[PDB]
């Protein structure tokens, strides 16, 4: 329950639970390229890259190469996102872009053929520019119905093949960097009222889509739907200091509790936020609280560099930033009453000059996975799957191509964009084969 | 499964609201019409959640489509009616949440309701 995580602040295992669910993920803007090919409409990131920044993986034209990389790793699932403006170029559900539909349908067919489970993310930051220009995007509560219409079409066209759905990837960053820091599209700065209005509409849009899925599609399709929430971790500078511990709790509440309390908790924002942020935080009606709570069939958790870098991504409140994924999972278990957890994104990054010998990625993966195994076996945390991030090198948002996060290397100056397994691809392949660390 | 209501006689410049009640999954609600001597033509349609409303050019800015899913009803508010709006109006439905203007893409149809606009 709300506040219980504060208690957390006061290689023993090789093999994961039998038939643990191993996977890997991408986002559409990071890997697809072909930003206006075949009638795809522009996203807010297409516009942002032109204004604020100065082909990528070409996944749109190299589907068979991505599939071969997935086969090499041997994953049981592949998380990817659908580019909304590739499917509906103006965001509204007028005539679908047939080549966009064909791409996602062919990808899903290829996964089903391989008995690889798709995990499909509806929104990974690429809002159709038409919705931003006409309404102000997520600032406008008209977005809730427009998003639900898009979700509805996706459930109808893809839900017989897709059994795991994610509405929104890391809504914290959508709101906070999109409208607070300006570091992400659409690049608005200050406007703290907009930050929390955007967060409010993301939560309400998510809830509407969960209720849509629960009522209209789950009975025949028998799948699961969640939302990927990201966080950092943090530790007190002075272990016995109750003020440092309180600030650690406030830090986690400010990033993760903001979105998880309404969806996974009691249906309302964290009480401390509702008071200090009273002039900017929208108020859930009593009817809305009942509709926000319980709108996630599992807890999807992101723990990666986007929640640590750059420095303005979150408030440390004078404490000590930590990469302790085991403790972060314990915080989730305590705050949100021991839910089933998918690690929907985990990994780190290298400088782009590191091509295939990504030794630090293996070091990070070993430590993260050991922490997950300890969380499962010592803390009884209900982690059922792990998404390595990312399948291949791509465009990394404001960092562009200056960092790499793929398990497969891509030479962006090569026309063929061959996916070359890095050291971490060989390592993760063996992890999956042995269901954990080598025996 | 689809039941129109609200047709009838009205004077030129007047208003009429048509409604279409379903009997119960999501659907796009559509309206078509057929005038004497002419083929059935698209009028307006609305997505499941109401975010996408589409109108034939001949009625854009005069007709307004809306829906109340709690009542399983789609509404067509027809204002500034003209003589050439006289027709049998058919409501229609399409399951896939994609708002199209083509009659072959709607697989559920009503019986039709006469609307007559005088001068
Ligand atoms: C959401 O988008 C709508 C549509 O653009 C906005 O409504 C317009 O608001 C302006 C300024 O207030 C008016 O001049 C227009 O007549 C409105 N058009 C409508 C209602 O169709 C609305 O302001 C936006 N809401 C937010 C919170 O940004
Ligand atoms: C707590 O420790 C971190 C890491 O050393 C440091 O950056 C921060 O300034 C410390 N807090 C205070 C209040 O000094």
Q: What is the CATH number of the domain that holds A253?
A: 3.20.20.80
Asked whether the CA dihedral A274, A275, A276, A277 is positive or negative, the reply is positive
Name the residue among A111, A153, A155, A116 with its Cα closest to residue A23.
A116
Q: How many Å lie between the alpha carbon of A118 and the closest alpha carbon of chain B?
A: 21
Name the residue among A79, A163, A76 with its Cα closest to residue A435.
A76
Whether residue A241 lies within 8 A of chain B, CB to CB, comes out as: no
Q: Which residues from chain A sit within 8 angstroms of residue B107, using beta carbons?
A: none
Cβ of A17 less than 6 Å from ligand 2: no
Name the residue among A127, A121, A203 with its Cα closest to residue A162.
A121
Number of other CB atoms surrounding residue A290 within 10 Å = 11
Determine the residue of A134, A140, A179, A195 to mutate for testing ligand 1's pocket, defined as the one with the most ligand atoms within 8 A of the Cβ atom: A140
Contact B97 A212 (CB under 8 A): no
Name the residue among B119, B112, B118, B82 with its Cα closest to residue B6.
B112
Residues A346, A23: contact at Cβ < 8 Å? no
Return the CA Rg of chain A: 20
The two three-digit tokens of residue A328, written as one number = 């972060």
Q: Note the ligand closest to the C-alpha atom of A144.
A: 1
Q: Mutating which of B48, B53, B68, B104 best tests the A interface, going by the most A Cβ atoms within 10 A?
A: B48
Contact B49 A156 (CB under 8 A): no
The DSSP output letter for B103 is: G
Whether residue B1 lies within 8 A of chain A, CB to CB, comes out as: no
A-facing residues of B in 11-30 (CB < 8 A) are 25-26
Q: Which residues from chain A sit within 8 angstroms of residue B49, using beta carbons?
A: 145-146, 148-149, 152, 208
Continuous segment of H or E residues that includes residue A408: strand A408-409
Cβ of A237 less than 6 Å from ligand 2: yes
Rounded to the nearest 10 degrees, how much is the dihedral formed by the CA atoms of A11, A14, A17, A22? Answer: 100
Place of tokens 């807010």: A44
Residues A356, A421: contact at Cβ < 8 Å? yes
A-facing residues of B in 58-87 (CB < 8 A) are none
Complete edge-to-edge strand list for the sheet that includes strand B73-78: B2-5, B16-22, B73-78, B63-68
* Cis bond upstream, residue A186 (ω within 30): yes
Residue A75: C-alpha distances to residues A172, A198, A429 (Å): 28, 35, 8
Asked whether the CA dihedral A24, A171, A33, B47 is positive or negative, the reply is positive
Q: Which residues from chain B sit within 8 angstroms of residue A131, using beta carbons?
A: none
Count Cα atoms within 13 angstroms, Cβ side, for A94.
12
Chain A residue at shortest CA distance from B95: A156
Determine the residue of A133, A142, A145, A200 to mutate for testing ligand 1's pocket, defined as the one with the most ligand atoms within 8 A of the Cβ atom: A142
- CA dist., res. A92 & res. A143, Å (int): 10
Continuous segment of H or E residues that includes residue A342: strand A340-346
Indicate the SS3 state at residue A183: coil
Smallest Cβ–Cβ distance between A153 and the set B50, B54, B98 belongs to: B98
* Cis bond upstream, residue B35 (ω within 30): no
State which ligand 2 atom lies nearest to the alpha carbon of A319: 1
Whether residue B109 lies within 8 A of chain A, CB to CB, comes out as: no
Method used for this model? X-ray
- CA dist., res. A327 & res. A8, Å (int): 7
Give residues with Cβ within 8 angstroms of A396, minimum separation 6. Answer: A30, A349, A402, A403, A404, A405
Residues A230, A307: contact at Cβ < 8 Å? yes
- CA dist., res. B41 & res. B31, Å (int): 9
Resolution of this entry, Å: 1.7
Residue B58 burial by Cβ neighbours in a 10 Å radius (0-12, 13-18, 19+): middle
Maximum distance among all Cα pairs of chain A, rounded to whole angstroms: 61
Number of other CB atoms surrounding residue A408 within 10 Å = 26
Continuous segment of H or E residues that includes residue A197: helix A192-212
Contact A94 B99 (CB under 8 A): yes
Contact B49 A95 (CB under 8 A): no
Place of tokens 């038409």: A130
Name the residue among A299, A320, A321, A430 with its Cα closest to residue A369.
A430
Residues A300, A345: contact at Cβ < 8 Å? no
Residues A24, A407: contact at Cβ < 8 Å? yes
Residue A421: C-alpha distances to residues A42, A163, A410 (Å): 31, 28, 9
Q: Which residues from chain B sit within 8 angstroms of residue A145, using beta carbons?
A: 49-51
Continuous segment of H or E residues that includes residue A135: helix A129-135
Name the residue among A189, A163, A328, A186 with its Cα closest to residue A260.
A328
Asked whether the CA dihedral A202, A206, A207, A208 is positive or negative, the reply is positive
- CA dist., res. B75 & res. A162, Å (int): 34
Residues A230, A168: contact at Cβ < 8 Å? no
Q: Which residues from chain B sit within 8 angstroms of residue A142, using beta carbons?
A: 51
Give the bridge partners for A387, in sequence order.
A23
Number of other CB atoms surrounding residue A289 within 10 Å = 15
Residues A365, A347: contact at Cβ < 8 Å? yes
- CA dist., res. A50 & res. A129, Å (int): 13
Asked whether the CA dihedral A361, A364, A367, A371 is positive or negative, the reply is negative
- CA dist., res. A299 & res. A172, Å (int): 15
- CA dist., res. B96 & res. A356, Å (int): 45
Domain that holds residue A91: 1-439
Number of other CB atoms surrounding residue A1 within 10 Å = 11
Count Cα atoms within 13 angstroms, Cβ side, for A260.
30
- CA dist., res. A280 & res. A257, Å (int): 17
- Measure A131 CA to ligand 1 centroid, in angstroms: 12
State which ligand 1 atom lies nearest to the alpha carbon of A136: 28
Instruction: Provide the number of structural domains found in chain A.
Output: 1
Smallest Cβ–Cβ distance between A96 and the set B26, B50, B98 belongs to: B98
Give residues with Cβ within 8 angstroms of A48, minimum separation 6. Answer: A184, A185, A186, A187
Whether residue B34 lies within 8 A of chain A, CB to CB, comes out as: no
- Measure A135 CA to ligand 1 centroid, in angstroms: 7
From atom 11 of ligand 2, which residue's Cα is the shortest distance away?
A318
Q: Characterise A428 by phi-psi region: left (phi > 0), alpha (psi -120 to 50), beta (else).
A: alpha
Give residues with Cβ within 8 angstroms of B100, minimum separation 6. Answer: A94, A95, B28, B45, B94, B106
Give the bridge partners for A228, in sequence order.
A169, A300
Number of other CB atoms surrounding residue B26 within 10 Å = 21
The DSSP output letter for A163 is: -
Smallest Cβ–Cβ distance between A94 and the set B25, B48, B52 belongs to: B52
Give the bridge partners for A436, in sequence order.
A15
């Amino acid at each position: 329950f709300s506040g219980d995580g504060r208690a957390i602040w006061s290689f023993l295992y090789d093999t994961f639970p039998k038939n643990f669910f191993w996977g890997i993920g991408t986002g559409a803007l990071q890997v697809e390229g072909s930003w206006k090919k075949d009638g795809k409409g522009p996203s807010i990131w297409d516009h942002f890259i032109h204004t604020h920044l100065k082909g990528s993986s070409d996944s749109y034209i190299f589907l068979e190469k991505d599939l071969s990389a997935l086969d090499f790793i041997g994953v049981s699932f592949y998380q990817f996102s659908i580019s909304w403006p590739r499917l509906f170029p103006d965001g509204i559900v007028t005539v679908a872009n047939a080549k966009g539909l064909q791409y996602y349908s062919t990808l899903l067919d290829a996964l089903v053929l391989r008995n690889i489970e798709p995990i499909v993310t509806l929104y990974h930051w690429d809002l159709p520019l038409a919705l931003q220009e006409k309404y102000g995007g997520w600032k406008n509560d008209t977005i809730i119905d427009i998003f639900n219409d898009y979700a509805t079409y996706c459930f109808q066209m893809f839900g017989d093949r897709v059994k795991y759905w994610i509405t929104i990837h890391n809504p914290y960053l959508v709101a906070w960097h999109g409208y607070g820091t300006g570091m992400h599209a659409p690049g608005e700065k200050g406007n703290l009222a907009a930050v929390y209005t955007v967060g409010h509409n993301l939560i309400k849009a998510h809830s509407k889509v969960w209720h849509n899925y629960n009522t209209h599609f789950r009975p025949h399709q028998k799948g699961w739907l969640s939302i990927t929430l990201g966080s950092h971790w943090i530790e007190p500078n002075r272990s016995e200091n109750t003020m440092d511990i309180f600030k650690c709790q406030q830090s986690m509440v400010s990033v993760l509790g903001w979105f998880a309390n309404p969806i996974h908790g009691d249906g309302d924002y964290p009480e401390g936020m509702r008071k200090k942020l009273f002039s900017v935080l929208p108020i859930f009606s009593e009817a809305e609280k009942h509709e926000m709570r319980g709108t996630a069939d599992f807890f999807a958790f992101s723990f990666g560099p986007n929640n640590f870098k750059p420095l303005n991504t979150m408030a440390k409140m004078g404490q000590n930033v930590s990469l302790n994924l085991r403790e972060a999972l314990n915080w989730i278990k305590l705050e949100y009453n021991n839910p089933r957890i998918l690690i929907a994104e985990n990994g780190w990054f290298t400088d782009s000059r590191v091509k295939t010998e990504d030794t630090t990625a293996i070091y990070m993966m070993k430590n993260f996975l050991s922490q997950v195994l300890q969380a499962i076996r010592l803390d009884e945390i209900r982690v059922f799957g792990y998404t390595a991030w990312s399948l291949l090198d791509g465009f990394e948002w404001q960092d562009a191509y200056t960092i790499r996060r793929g398990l497969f290397y891509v030479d962006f100056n090569s026309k063929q964009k061959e996916r070359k397994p890095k050291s971490s691809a060989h390592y993760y392949k063996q992890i999956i084969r042995e269901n954990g660390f080598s025996l | 499964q689809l039941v129109e209501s609200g047709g009838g006689l009205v004077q030129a410049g007047g208003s009429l609201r048509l409604s279409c009640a379903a009997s119960q999954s999501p659907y796009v609600g559509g309206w078509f019409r057929q005038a004497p001597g002419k083929e059935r033509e698209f009028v307006a349609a609305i997505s499941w959640s109401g975010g996408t409303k589409l109108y034939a050019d001949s009625v854009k800015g005069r007709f307004t489509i809306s829906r109340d899913n709690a009542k399983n009803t789609v509404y067509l508010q027809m204002n500034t009616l003209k003589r050439e709006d006289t027709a049998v109006y058919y409501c229609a439905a399409r399951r896939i949440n994609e708002v199209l203007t083509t009659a072959p893409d709607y697989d559920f149809w009503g019986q039709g309701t006469q609307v007559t606009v005088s001068s």
